[PDB]
Design an enzyme around this catalytic site. Structure first.
Site, PDB file in Angstrom:
ATOM      1  N   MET A  80       0.812  -1.213   0.000  1.00 17.36           N
ATOM      2  CA  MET A  80       0.000   0.000   0.000  1.00 17.36           C
ATOM      3  C   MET A  80       0.848   1.265   0.000  1.00 17.36           C
ATOM      4  O   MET A  80       0.460   2.277  -0.583  1.00 17.36           O
ATOM      5  CB  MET A  80      -0.947   0.012   1.201  1.00 17.36           C
ATOM      6  CG  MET A  80      -2.047  -1.031   1.130  1.00 17.36           C
ATOM      7  SD  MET A  80      -3.582  -0.453   1.876  1.00 17.36           S
ATOM      8  CE  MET A  80      -3.988   0.910   0.786  1.00 17.36           C
ATOM      9  N   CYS A 101       1.010  -6.373  12.852  1.00 14.75           N
ATOM     10  CA  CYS A 101       0.239  -6.814  14.005  1.00 14.75           C
ATOM     11  C   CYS A 101      -0.381  -5.674  14.808  1.00 14.75           C
ATOM     12  O   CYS A 101      -0.960  -5.906  15.869  1.00 14.75           O
ATOM     13  CB  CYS A 101       1.111  -7.673  14.920  1.00 14.75           C
ATOM     14  SG  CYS A 101       1.173  -9.407  14.430  1.00 14.75           S
TER      15      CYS A 101
END
Ligand SMILES: [Zn+2]
Ligand SMILES: [Zn+2]
Lengths: 882, 529
Positions: free
Chosen positions: A451, A508
């Site tokens: 991204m 995470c």
């Protein structure tokens, strides 16, 4: 964007479950797990037990039958049974009946091949309560212990397993199994294929066969003898742990095996007010690499009844010298190849037990290949060109008996190239992982997903034949599941059968705390990129799957992220495992522990973890994982040692031209030759007119002054800063740090000066805002919060030429957490090129964007050497599938 | 270039005679580069017999007077004569006998025409029990090899029985003690310890085309720098011809020195320095680019590699070059030079880009000295130079010549200028005349441009004299000067100066009492460009 694109399988797994290194390990260590079925159990009272039919085979004391009957219920071989634990504890022992027999010595007996409860694996509470796992664990048992005949089915993967991704679970509830389970290494694998002969067909047990294979493999035995003497017996080849050692082969040894004949102020506390915070800092270094010997004699001493003792196999070897083992010592290692050795006529006798593996050690001139082609063509290759004389401290040509007897090269007289795996790299970054995999020769990364635009650009630059998607992975996966061929801009989407290898490093963020899930954090993890990645895995069904992350991934939310990941992979029908790797053990100087999750398709062979190539600081090499009070290790057999010397900062960046704080030049000359093996590897053999991205951040005048006032001596950081007035580059004046308070814990200087900078030292929890100090050479904020943060060791610290990088970060800050960033000599933070060098990036590897962009790209990347090691470990599995 | 309709149907058969073996000082039979062949363009499908007829007729021999020993490559990389049966294999295509190899080299064994006119013919050869050995004699005194032809001999023959042959073939008195080696391959010469053993036993993998080197057993040999054939072939194996070239000299053909692969930097430097009559420290070396012909990476004085490392990426075909340059200072001092990019201002008030290399630990003085060595000054001016620091087209300072060079950072916006001091600024009246910093700017004072400069200022100057001095410096247009707006800039504020009022005195240019640390007032000019 919030909700993660998912498969019904994965979604169900994470829904049916409903209800930044904190260094989780400096360890109160555990022996761990302790084969579980040991001990006694409750016997059952059965009124009638009788053998149906007649004995199929009779043996020395046993008499085997095909089928027995307990209280009017029949029971055949191959059936499964339930036995009761003697303890009131819940687990209900389950087994498979492998043999039935009457032993007049012992009684009516059967052989129980135990199952493992899914909740007794790593899976724990995550496991399907109906799921069992094959183990090696079996025992003979009297039939009376059988409580009941239970049904267990084998959930075999379909012939169309690779397309079953995305299909809904509609496709009663009984015990089932699909995977065998190694408990020490936490390895879920496909059920062992080992077949019975027809003589043992009735009594055949897989666990017994594998126990046999194993225990037979690991007893060292001599093979073909060739000479008998008065005191001893000589052999040509010995074998151990599956590997074969002939006379003349290379041998790894511990540093303990043999030795070489070579002969082996108070501080001014006015000027240096914070130096005392180093006195609590006054760590075992990296181990010696393997001793290397050449097998001259293989012999067993006679027992002096005149017969050889083959428990006492012994090896006589020729010692090899590493350049650093000579009189020239450690600095001889700087320029030398890591696989370079010297022949010696020195000899030594060692036990065959001490041998840690076989290596290849050739004479470089008799090589058909060029030396480096040879060096880069196989795992364990060393060479020598000369011989060392420790007595004369000199070098000469090798003796003729040293040029391997095997290749004369005259005559009689009187390379499997695999197709590369199409790889999808999710959260690719600039593509270090894909780089290492390309180096392994196993992959062609055709699709990538990132991204962040600069990183995507970089990946494009380094992989022009690939397709990089910058859109959210969720909407892409959603596009694919919707049967869309392309995205909005026309880029072709990967389809089932296209992706053969799936690799990635999911962020995470937000579940990354250690403590237990609440509904909130679990709501966040439920739609995390980890679940998206696992959804990609379930949908595409690649032959291989790699999930890399920070180490604490195995400890996140008390290991629930890990457990759920593994559980999901198992639900897909994958063979899977996890482990921890130190990057430093694989050819870089950095400390960078990574959690690695591996998975392979049913028809495949599950990859091992790479055996460490380089010795490294033990403190940075704690690879074990504690999950629910069980200690799990990986298959790695190398703990205390390794083949190659550790890589250093000197090896990493000693060849780079001297630059200055805020160096902006994108293209400069190397202005020299590669000075080390490492540099030679990362620069290549071909001339390179342009060195790229050797550039540094531009630090404020204050920070620059501080940096230039840090001493060059190893171990130097902010605590060595003199307290003095300094004239800054911008014309500003840096005032001395004033000490306005008496520090309880740290006391008083020899001069009697105060060590506190603030009221908060008195625990009063005030923080006189008027007492904050600015523009000091010694940063106020560091003695301010020093006592609570281990005196901020390493901040404004310099790298050591002999040392290694602390984990390479995205944005080096002298006052950051990772903050020993400084150059060993020059005054500046390390350059982008230097960080890339610390990551094992080839100098020709392209980055993109401004300097912080490149720094970040380098920082978030998997070190290509590590990925290369893993990749080779996968290559083995690719080869093994025939 | 252009192929042909059936060029693919032919193959090169290169015939070599024994005369080419004489004089060869290297390994095996001959040098591939120096050997003279008799070349045949032959149909691949041609029979051996047809080629034997053609050869015998062309070169002038009876077909039963020649024997063909195909030059065959071994695993070790050597190339030795192999056995060919003229009768048995005579009907086979040349392309199958060559094993698709092409060009295909063959040794041609004939009888000496001077010993054949006397009636002798070609000896018989038993393929199973005989072998063809080649004999070389090493002379330690001259350090050279002498080809002593070949022999047919039974495999079972004893080494001791080959000695008389070796002796009389080399012109040795009979019963001369000989040291025997087998030339197995380059860098492998193995001494024969037992002469009482058969050829089979003495030589592992005994083949046709094997080579035995022999020399006198004589104490005098220890006076030679290469006493044995072993050491000879060793030194030869590591021998290499290096072409040293000066990178400064255009198209320098360079000079060729014969050296050893093992040599370190010190030895090489010493050698070249000797052939150049200079101190080794006054030499800097450059590895070759090596794909291109030209100087590559420079070598540090501490370079730990060898000559082989420096030449390893040359092809065995390629000439092996090594670059260098002669230095005016010892190479360590030369390595401690600091690349300093700055701007030189000339007599014409024009900017030039220059790069100087003062010592890294030196002062501003040394930099200025380099710049003085590099340029020419005005017809008459001070002859004294100075170093300005310029940012945003404004002079932010003058650096005193004792200042350290390590305290300077030639950054992006930071430009260091060097200029000759004008005569009326060398020695001025300190409490009367003052040097002021001057700069251009368009519209407001943030936007700046042009070449800033230092201007002398008198007392009660009569401001348009000072402006005709400025004008005397600039000289662009002749009263387009007129449009100049003159201003005094201080901490961002600016007050324009009335040109005909002539308001000038130092007091309007110094900061507050005792002030240095923050920026001093400067003169501003408005006119754009
Ligand atoms: Zn068993
Ligand atoms: Zn405070």
């Amino acid at each position: 964007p919030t909700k993660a694109t998912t498969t019904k399988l994965v979604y169900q797994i994470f829904d049916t479950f409903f209800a930044d290194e904190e260094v989780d390990d400096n360890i109160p260590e555990m022996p761990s797990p302790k084969k579980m079925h040991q001990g006694k159990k409750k016997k059952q009272n059965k009124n009638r037990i009788s053998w149906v039919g007649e004995a199929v085979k009779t043996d020395g004391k046993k008499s085997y039958y095909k089928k027995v009957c307990i209280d009017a219920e029949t029971l055949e071989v191959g059936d499964c049974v339930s036995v009761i634990p003697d303890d009131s504890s819940k687990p209900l022992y389950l087994a498979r009946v492998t043999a039935l027999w009457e032993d007049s010595s012992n009684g009516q007996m059967f052989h129980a091949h135990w199952f493992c409860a899914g909740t007794d694996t790593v899976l724990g509470a995550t496991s399907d309560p109906l799921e069992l796992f094959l183990v090696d664990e079996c025992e003979d048992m009297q039939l009376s212990y059988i409580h009941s005949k239970v049904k267990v089915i084998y959930k075999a993967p379909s012939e169309n397993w690779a397309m079953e991704g995305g299909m809904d679970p509609e496709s009663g509830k009984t015990y089932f199994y699909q995977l065998w389970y190694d408990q020490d290494y936490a390895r879920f694998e496909s059920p062992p294929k080992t077949q019975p002969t027809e003589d043992n067909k009735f009594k055949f047990c897989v666990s017994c066969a594998r126990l046999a294979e194993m225990r037979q493999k690991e007893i060292p035995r001599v093979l073909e003898q060739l000479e008998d003497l008065d005191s001893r017996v000589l052999y040509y080849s010995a074998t151990k742990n599956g590997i074969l050692y002939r006379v003349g082969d290379g041998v790894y040894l511990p540093p303990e095996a043999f030795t070489f004949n070579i002969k082996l102020e108070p501080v001014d506390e006015d000027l240096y007010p914070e130096h005392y915070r180093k006195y609590s800092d006054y760590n075992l270094d990296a181990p010696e690499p393997y001793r290397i010997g050449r097998i001259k004699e293989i012999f067993c001493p006679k027992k002096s009844n005149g017969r050889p003792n083959e428990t006492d196999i012994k090896i006589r070897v020729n010692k090899f010298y590493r350049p650093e083992n000579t009189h020239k010592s450690t600095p001889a290692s700087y320029h030398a190849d890591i696989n370079l050795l010297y022949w010696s006529d020195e000899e030594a006798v060692v036990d065959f037990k001490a041998v840690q593996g076989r290596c290849t050690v050739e004479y470089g001139e008799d090589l058909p290949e060029c030396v480096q082609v040879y060096s880069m063509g196989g795992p364990n290759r060393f060479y020598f060109l000369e011989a060392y004389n420790a007595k004369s401290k000199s070098f000469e040509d090798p003796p003729n008996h040293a040029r391997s007897p095997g290749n004369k090269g005259k005559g009689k007289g009187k390379e499997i190239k695999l197709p590369k795996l199409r790889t999808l790299d999710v959260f690719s970054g600039c593509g270090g992982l894909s780089e290492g995999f390309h180096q392994a020769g196993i992959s062609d990364t055709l699709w990538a997903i990132e991204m962040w635009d600069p990183a995507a650009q970089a990946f494009r630059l380094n992989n022009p034949g690939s397709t990089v998607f910058t859109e959210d992975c969720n909407i892409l996966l959603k596009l694919v599941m919707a049967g869309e061929t392309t995205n909005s801009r026309g880029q072709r989407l990967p389809q089932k059968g296209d992706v053969e290898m799936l690799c990635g490093g999911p962020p995470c963020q937000g579940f990354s705390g250690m403590n237990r899930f609440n509904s909130r954090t679990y709501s966040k993890f439920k739609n995390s990129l980890v679940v998206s990645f696992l959804s990609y895995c379930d949908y595409y069904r690649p032959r291989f799957f790699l999930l890399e992350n920070v180490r604490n991934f195995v400890s996140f939310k008390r290991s629930m992220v890990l457990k759920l990941t593994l559980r999901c992979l198992v639900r897909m029908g994958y063979q899977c495992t996890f482990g921890v790797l130190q990057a430093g053990q694989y050819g870089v100087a950095q400390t960078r522990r990574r959690a690695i999750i591996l998975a392979a398709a049913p028809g495949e062979k599950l990859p091992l973890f790479p055996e460490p190539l380089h010795v490294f600081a033990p403190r940075a090499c704690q690879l074990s994982v504690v999950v629910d009070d069980k200690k799990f290790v990986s298959n790695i057999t190398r703990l205390s040692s390794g083949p190659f010397r550790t890589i250093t900062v000197r090896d990493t960046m000693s060849d780079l031209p001297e630059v200055r704080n805020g160096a902006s030049a994108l293209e400069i000359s190397y202005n020299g030759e590669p000075q080390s093996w490492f540099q030679r590897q990362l620069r290549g053999a071909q001339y390179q007119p342009i060195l790229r991205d050797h550039i540094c951040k531009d630090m404020s005048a204050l920070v620059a002054a501080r940096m230039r006032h840090i001493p060059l001596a190893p171990g130097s950081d902010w605590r060595d800063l003199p307290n003095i007035e300094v004239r800054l580059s911008d014309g500003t004046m840096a005032r001395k740090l004033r000490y306005t308070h008496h520090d309880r814990k740290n006391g008083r200087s020899s001069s009697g000066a105060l060590r506190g900078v603030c009221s908060c030292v008195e625990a009063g929890k005030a923080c006189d805002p008027a007492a904050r100090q600015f523009n000091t050479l010694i940063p106020w904020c560091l003695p301010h919060t020093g006592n609570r943060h281990n005196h901020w060791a390493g901040l404004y610290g310099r790298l050591e030429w002999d040392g290694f990088f602390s984990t390479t970060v995205t944005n080096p800050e002298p006052m950051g957490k990772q903050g020993r960033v400084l150059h060993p000599e020059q005054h500046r933070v390390v350059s982008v090129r230097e960080c890339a060098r610390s990551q094992g990036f080839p100098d020709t590897y392209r980055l993109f964007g401004n300097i912080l962009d490149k720094h970040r790209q380098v920082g978030n990347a998997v070190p290509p050497p590590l990925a290369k090691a893993i990749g080779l470990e996968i290559k083995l599995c690719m080869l093994a599938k025939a | 270039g252009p192929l042909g309709s059936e060029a693919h149907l032919y193959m090169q058969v290169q015939i070599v005679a024994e005369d080419q073996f004489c004089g060869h000082q290297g390994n095996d039979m001959y040098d591939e580069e120096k050997v003279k062949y008799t070349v045949f363009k032959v149909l691949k499908n041609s029979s051996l017999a047809e080629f034997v007829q053609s050869l015998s007729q062309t070169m002038g021999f009876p077909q039963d007077q020649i024997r063909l020993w195909p030059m065959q490559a071994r695993s070790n990389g050597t190339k030795r004569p192999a056995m060919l049966d003229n009768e048995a294999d005579g009907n086979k295509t040349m392309i199958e006998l060559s094993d698709n190899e092409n060009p295909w080299t063959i040794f041609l064994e004939t009888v000496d025409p001077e010993l054949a006119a006397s009636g002798a013919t070609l000896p018989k050869f038993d393929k199973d029990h005989d072998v063809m050995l080649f004999l070389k004699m090493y002379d330690p005194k001259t350090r050279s090899l002498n080809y002593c032809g070949h022999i047919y001999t039974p495999i079972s023959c004893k080494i001791r029985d080959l000695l008389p042959v070796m002796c009389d073939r080399a012109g040795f008195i009979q019963d001369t003690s000989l040291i025997l080696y087998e030339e197995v391959k380059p860098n492998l010469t193995e001494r024969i310890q037992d002469y009482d053993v058969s050829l089979d036993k003495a030589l592992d993998e005994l083949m046709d085309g094997d080579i035995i080197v022999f020399q006198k057993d004589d104490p005098e040999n220890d006076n030679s720098e290469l006493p044995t054939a072993k050491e000879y072939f060793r030194d030869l194996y590591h021998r290499v011809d290096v072409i040293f070239c000066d990178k400064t000299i255009p198209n320098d053909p360079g000079f060729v020195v014969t050296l050893s692969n093992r040599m370190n930097y010190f030895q090489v430097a010493k050698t070249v320095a000797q052939r150049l009559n200079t101190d080794p420290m006054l030499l800097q070396f450059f590895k070759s680019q090596g794909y291109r012909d030209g100087p590559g990476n420079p070598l540090r004085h501490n370079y730990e590699g060898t000559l082989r490392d420096l030449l390893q990426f040359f092809k065995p075909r390629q000439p092996k070059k090594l670059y260098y340059q002669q230095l005016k200072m010892k190479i360590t001092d030369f390595e401690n030079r600091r690349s300093f990019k700055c701007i030189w201002l000339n007599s014409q008030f024009r900017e030039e880009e220059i790069t100087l290399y003062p010592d890294k630990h030196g002062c501003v003085r040394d930099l200025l000295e380099e710049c003085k060595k590099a340029v020419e000054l005005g017809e008459k001016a001070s002859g004294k130079l100075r170093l300005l620091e310029i940012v945003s087209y404004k002079i932010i300072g003058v650096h005193q010549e004792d200042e350290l060079l390590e305290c300077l950072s030639p950054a992006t916006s930071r430009t260091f200028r060097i200029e000759e001091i004008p005569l009326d600024q060398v020695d001025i009246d300190k409490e009367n005349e003052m040097l002021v910093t001057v700069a251009h700017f368009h519209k407001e004072v943030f936007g700046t441009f042009g070449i800033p400069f230092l201007l002398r200022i008198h007392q009660g100057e009569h401001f348009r004299e000072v402006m005709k001095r400025i004008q005397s410096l600039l000289d662009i247009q002749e009263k387009e000067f007129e449009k100049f707006k003159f201003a005094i800039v201080m901490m961002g504020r600016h007050q324009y100066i009335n040109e005909d009022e002539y308001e000038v005195n130092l007091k309007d240019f110094e900061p507050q009492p005792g002030n240095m640390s923050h920026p001093r007032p400067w003169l501003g000019l408005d006119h754009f460009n």
